[PDB]
Design a protein around this ligand. Structure first.
Ligand SMILES: *[C@@H]1O[C@H](CO)[C@@H](O)[C@H](O)[C@H]1NC(C)=O
Ligand SMILES: *[C@@H]1O[C@H](CO)[C@@H](O)[C@H](O)[C@H]1NC(C)=O
Lengths: 41, 50
């Protein structure tokens, strides 16, 4: 979700709006991916 | 939309290029980087212009 502080992403398929895996980046909010400290290509 | 490469990695690439051309001459553009002292590469850079 682009440029949205995801404290309110599901307020406005339910599995892709829950808090199973939420990551906050500069581009927006990412749902469905796990953050990893390791670095790859 | 934000840029894909933030300024830090751009600075990292520039520093990598600068260190490579300072230490290894121009041999890092062809294959493996080959070490050479700096005065003897400025000497060959003169020798390349007559
Ligand atoms: C996003 O929303 C939260 C509300 O929980 C707020 O505390 C934060 O300052 C907002 N901005 C961010 C995380 O950049
Ligand atoms: C990654 O590093 C941070 C900071 O040390 C740590 O809190 C976290 O447990 C590490 N692992 C993951 C999966 O985030």
């Amino acid at each position: 979700y682009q440029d949205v502080n995801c404290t309110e992403v599901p307020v406005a398929w339910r599995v892709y709006s829950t808090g199973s895996n939420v990551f906050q980046t500069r581009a927006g909010c990412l749902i469905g991916a796990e953050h990893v400290n390791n670095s790859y290509e | 939309l934000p840029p894909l490469l933030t300024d830090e990695m751009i600075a990292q690439y520039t520093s990598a290029l600068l260190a490579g051309t300072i230490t290894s001459g121009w041999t890092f553009g062809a294959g493996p980087a080959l070490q050479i002292p700096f005065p003897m590469q400025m000497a060959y850079r003169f020798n390349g212009i007559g």
